[PDB]
Design a protein around this ligand. Sequence first.
Ligand SMILES: Cc1cc2nc3c(=O)[nH]c(=O)nc-3n(C[C@H](O)[C@H](O)[C@H](O)COP(=O)(O)O)c2cc1C
Ligand code: SF4
Ligand code: SF4
Ligand code: SF4
Ligand code: FES
Ligand code: FES
Ligand SMILES: [Ca+2]
Lengths: 905, 156, 148
Amino acid sequence: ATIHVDGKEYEVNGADNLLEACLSLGLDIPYFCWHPALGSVGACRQCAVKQYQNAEDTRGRLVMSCMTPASDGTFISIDDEEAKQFRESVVEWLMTNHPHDCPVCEEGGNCHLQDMTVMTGHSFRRYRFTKRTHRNQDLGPFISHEMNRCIACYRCVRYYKDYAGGTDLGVYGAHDNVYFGRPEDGTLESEFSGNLVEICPTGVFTDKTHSERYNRKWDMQFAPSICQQCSIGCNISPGERYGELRRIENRYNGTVNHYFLCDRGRFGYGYVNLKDRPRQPVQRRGDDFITLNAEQAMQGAADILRQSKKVIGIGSPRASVESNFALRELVGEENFYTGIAHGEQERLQLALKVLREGGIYTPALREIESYDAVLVLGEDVTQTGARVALAVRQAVKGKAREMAAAQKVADWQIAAILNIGQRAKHPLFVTNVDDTRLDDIAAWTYRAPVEDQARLGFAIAHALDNSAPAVDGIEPELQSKIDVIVQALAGAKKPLIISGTNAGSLEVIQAAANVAKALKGRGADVGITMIARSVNSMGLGIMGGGSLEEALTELETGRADAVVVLENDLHRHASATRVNAALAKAPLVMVVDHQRTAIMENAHLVLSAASFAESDGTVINNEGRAQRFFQVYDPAYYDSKTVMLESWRWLHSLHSTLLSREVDWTQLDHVIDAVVAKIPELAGIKDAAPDATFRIRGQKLAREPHRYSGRTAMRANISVHEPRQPQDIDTMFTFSMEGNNQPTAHRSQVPFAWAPGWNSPQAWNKFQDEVGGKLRFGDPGVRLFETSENGLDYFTSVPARFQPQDGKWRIAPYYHLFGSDELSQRAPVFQSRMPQPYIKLNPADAAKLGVNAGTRVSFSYDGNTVTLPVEIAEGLTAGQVGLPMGMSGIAPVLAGAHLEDLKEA
Amino acid sequence: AFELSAAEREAIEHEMHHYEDPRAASIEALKIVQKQRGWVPDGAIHAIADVLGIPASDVEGVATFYSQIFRQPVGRHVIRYCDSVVCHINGYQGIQAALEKKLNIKPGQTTFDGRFTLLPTCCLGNCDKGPNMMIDEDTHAHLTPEAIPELLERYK
Amino acid sequence: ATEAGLLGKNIMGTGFDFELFVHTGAGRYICGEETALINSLEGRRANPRSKPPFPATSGAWGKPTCVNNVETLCNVPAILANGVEWYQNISKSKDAGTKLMGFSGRVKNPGLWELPFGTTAREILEDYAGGMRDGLKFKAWQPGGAGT
Ligand SMILES: Cc1cc2nc3c(=O)[nH]c(=O)nc-3n(C[C@H](O)[C@H](O)[C@H](O)COP(=O)(O)O)c2cc1C
Ligand code: SF4
Ligand code: SF4
Ligand code: SF4
Ligand code: FES
Ligand code: FES
Ligand SMILES: [Ca+2]
């Protein structure tokens, strides 16, 4: 398609509207109510241009560039006098009721309305009358509400209802008294409600967790990082001021997590700012806790490790690839144990075998939205992999998208698309032990135990392909539902099967693999997605090693007299009493961690490791994509006594001091090269990000904006002399503003989006090749493995049906986005959002036990009696008791286990 | 504490029988609740949402959008006087002044004993017989300020 | 009409089935806009819709929908009963048929009459509405309501 903007010819896409096409060309058109992820509605009337019928036309007519397709031979003008006057008039009309609030507004300096007021050239007020006002609502602990600043652009309601699928936010009222919020005061119930702080172009919805310790955008030190709160691996921009992690912003990755994060990643960063974190190496000597610096810590640790007869290392899926590899090199490959349980490791290795050996393509997070039917087996996606649930919602709305496409309606005209596809949607079949948050859009939901969900998957795979093993004992109603699922999956051009290791069942993963293989054998374009547990679960599975139980037996038998635990609390993967006894028996325990865990009391040496905000490294997400996260700030810049290093730095220096009695720390690229050389399965992490010698025309990449302030006063209370700027020898970024952050710079890692005239998160449009697409020079991250040429065989281990045995209670896992993650519960802002710890019971089981809803019952697990209140779960199958996984005192390894003497306290 | 009555619920289901989408009975469900109880209370939004299977935010937005669905308590009789252009030509301001003198309240307010609620309203489609007033179900035309307190005494 | 067989199932034995309902509104002026009318019919807020697509292609609940005024549908049966040649010979003007016209506001006879198109506004004011009232002189007029 050929367009002519202000007499200049451009080649665009005819399927795009004029606004996104002109923004992709670098032209500036003001806009409020259009979003690339949400489509065009024509509400704010800000994107007006002047369209001409032909080339020799002078009058023209004001059209809206978001509502006008960028067809071939189009003639428009942006800098026309009438279009400029109308855009300034629209800004003026929006400014008639706006409060004089910019100094006391958290959106100041980050405001789209500020940028568009300046861009339209409106700086003189002639409106002399009153301004309308609105009371505010309490929207919970994460979102702060201020309705006076609203411009009625309907972005919040469109995102929250059409895109996110939420129900409790809406628009109320009339002509100029439109109110946007909840019908009553209460917490916003959506798991993706935190994206409202970037969706809203004004300061109506603001980050309250950031608003506590608020600082402006220009004062932030930003980094490109990966969110560590689950396995999806969404790209984030952590921003820091005065030595504390101030905010998490969404970093655009067109392949993974383009515009949106979930609430756990956006608000669960508060564990970094905890005051109980280790900041210096501490050595235990009797009842004394001697604080050392790094050199004598390495010397002492080297002597005690050299005096030991066998040293073992227990890793974690929390730690990066480099840190786990450094521990594995320090203790040896045969003495390296993964920090997860045997069942967790078996499920994770089976998921990895399915992903990189099953011959079925694993889609990216953005690619999930283009699938025609979704079957979720066992995995509570909204509570474990929430962004996959959001992409599943988009894939479900794909049917309305294609129905509107069949009527020659453009893909950006979202209102007509939703009008045509009223309630028709792509098939979604979710299985769980109880209700999920995807039940409102699911074609079917199966509330059953994990054995029954696995049997349903095996029956689906057998009905799709008769070479798969059959299931005997299917009820006719269950057979009818299986036939419905099979008829939906067989007629889908792009079926998608989503499972994971959080269900606590190997057979669920086997059934999902069988369904994917049966769909692949029919020639369908089937994709499979496995949801892991932690941020680097896939990387720890690829690296491999023994389980935690083998390490505990090695400690208990006396064969290992020294244990090095890397960033693992060890209570989430095994029983606490066994771990405590095995660690107390060992004469040397060294815990390398950034959080104050419970096993540090028995630890002889504690190494103050760095979190993701203070370290660089590589993490492998659930799809096998290696992603590099970069250090945000130097911990020792403010507190000069703080000795907090990277975990791989700690362990590599320890290995060097053990081998040659000299302290060499590392460079990060050396550890990357060591990983690539020693582990050929992790050889793709070299190309995840360029090395520390990468420059943009000779200069580094800036972590903080060019208008960063306070440089001669941030440390003036400690010392009036300005200290040395922190040097970054590990990566290509610099701890200063003397770098490159141009939108046209040839790079893939963007610490933050800023353009002249675009201070809001809309500068990502300037940082993309086309608006709403990918990054201009490719998205960061590289897939570790390609799709295999040949697949697996059918798993013939069909489990027997769930039999409720008397006196034993099967623990059904319940996951919560706020509470199940290990580090997110440590964030103090989560405790208001974290649920109370209950236990779920069937009505029949509660009536048999004589217990009501809310009464306290006590159960003993591994000789430990604990009491919890009771809810009555209607969808939970009898013979099962429902436990919330990852909570205080409930380890995630309890999923799929059994319970004894569960009785009323 | 709100609970929908049996007659209200059955009328609501009979209203959703008329459409291919149960959402389309939200306006008439709110009108049924308003006719039964004078106005639409806070729990009525959640009750109508639970019956209709739509979120309560959409029901609240519909109830706050439409002027004839009252989300605040009103009196036993609602006076609605036309203030549009033809009745402005015919002099609705004398009628409004007589109403404010007799009821001792401003428009949008309720009498202290809860008998009358005075409200302006748009054109009633009776411009040839203006000015017009609309009490609860009856429209009165050819109004004069002298006939206002005589007319108001027949609504006990 | 339902009792007489004019509505419902098998109207006049011809196999055509038609069901007619009355949707009483909740008092908002914007609901008269046809796309806002469709949105209000669906139980939503009466925000209008952008056209294209027009309601003929995708209107009420995504289905083909035609919205017409009361007076157009009242003009339809006269056309179907008396014919096209009668309807085109009502008036010698570009706009065929009759129209409900009338004058309102401090005139002698504020009312409503049915006149052919091409009837000048002075005949409506003076020959039908009787002109202005006593002691009042004509200043201005709006031809077609408050929006003209
Ligand atoms: C703001 C607005 C209000 C309208 N209100 C009405 C109305 O109350 N009644 C009506 O018949 N048409 C109304 N219309 C016109 C309709 O859009 C549409 O023309 C009409 O319903 C059907 O067209 P017809 O004249 O061919 O029958 C309104 C239009 C607008 C823009
Ligand atoms: S929302 Fe923007 S324009 Fe409004 S007060 Fe805040 S910074 Fe100023
Ligand atoms: S609250 Fe924000 S996103 Fe919602 S309509 Fe107002 S300005 Fe737009
Ligand atoms: S989905 Fe997972 S990786 Fe993404 S923001 Fe949420 S917790 Fe972080
Ligand atoms: S962006 Fe086009 S009218 Fe709002
Ligand atoms: S202007 Fe008052 S009834 Fe029409
Ligand atoms: Ca570093």
